[PDB]
Structure 1
Amino acid sequence: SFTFASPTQVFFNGANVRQVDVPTQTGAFGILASHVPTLQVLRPGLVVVHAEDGTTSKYFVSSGSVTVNADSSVQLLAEEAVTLDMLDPGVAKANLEKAQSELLGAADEASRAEIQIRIEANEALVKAL
């Protein structure tokens, strides 16, 4: 029972994929259809959905929530979840290098942390692409 959907598009509703990996804020986690119930905050990265069948899916997602209850119902909510093909690897590298260049530009600690979020998202994008 996998509930994966963006605010605009729906990927999986009650799907028995039984295996989902999420880029959590603290790190990475793996759902195994029996994983301990927990609430996990998403991090810039890609959700590699592994269905019960041998086929798998790879979607790069924005921040969000990984809500796996005591049961198998997992409600994965990603703000901007798209497949890797829609993205551009060249634009990915360009954005990463520009963000690295502008990291020191933001004198404010909060603003530099925001640009650090940007560079982290671009690095995860580069690794995914």
Structure 2
Amino acid sequence: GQMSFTFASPTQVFFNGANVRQVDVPTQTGAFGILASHVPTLQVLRPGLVVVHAEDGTTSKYFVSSGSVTVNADSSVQLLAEEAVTLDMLDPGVAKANLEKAQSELLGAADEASRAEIQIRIEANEALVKAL
């Protein structure tokens, strides 16, 4: 109700300024539904889907690489995304071998900074394989 669902990207503007009902936000500390008087929170996002709910028959499916919420004082949530990619342009065959690749390179990290980074890489690669 009375909610301007803003959502975009640097390449192409997605669902923008339209009164859409419910948005899924993929976020560290989990996913939380936006229900029409949602409490304002400036939390940034983790990799995952956004399944956005409108009255137009059925829901759409997208995928955010690394986004940010700024839901304001009134009923206006603005979502951003670096890569709000569509799912169907993804190739499963090369995507699986990446997950076993980085775990095979975990113990080749002689420093402490990159050892978190390969833990980032498998988490981003685990994010897509449950999705697909």
Equivalent position SS for 2:32: strand
Distance 2:109 2:25 in 1: 30
Structure 1 unaligned segments of length 5 or more: list them.
none
**Which has more radius of gyration?**
2
**What is the number of residues matched between the two proteins?**
129
Distance 1:53 1:34 in 2: 22
Distance 2:125 2:61 in 1: 17
Q: CA RMSD in A?
A: 1.5
Structure 2 unaligned segments of length 5 or more: list them.
none
Equivalent position SS for 1:13: coil
CA positional deviation for 1:54: 3.5
Distance 2:59 2:28 in 1: 23
The structure-2 alpha-carbon separation of the partners of 1:57 and 1:104, relative to structure 1 and needing over 3 Å to count, comes to: farther
Distance 2:107 2:74 in 1: 46
The structure-2 alpha-carbon separation of the partners of 1:105 and 1:9, relative to structure 1 and needing over 3 Å to count, comes to: farther
Distance 1:77 1:36 in 2: 18
Per the alignment, residue 92 of structure 1 pairs with 95
Q: Give TM-score scaled by structure 2 length.
A: 0.88
Q: Deviations over 1:36-61 (max 9, x none)?
A: 11112110111111223342111111
Moved over 4 A (4+): none
Which has the larger strand fraction?
1
Equivalent position SS for 2:50: strand
Q: Give TM-score scaled by structure 1 length.
A: 0.90
Q: Percent identity?
A: 100
The structure-2 alpha-carbon separation of the partners of 1:106 and 1:48, relative to structure 1 and needing over 3 Å to count, comes to: farther
Distance 2:91 2:98 in 1: 10
Q: Deviations over 1:56-101 (max 9, x none)?
A: 1111111120111122221111111111111112222122121222
On the 8 A contact 1:4/1:10 being kept in 2, the answer is yes
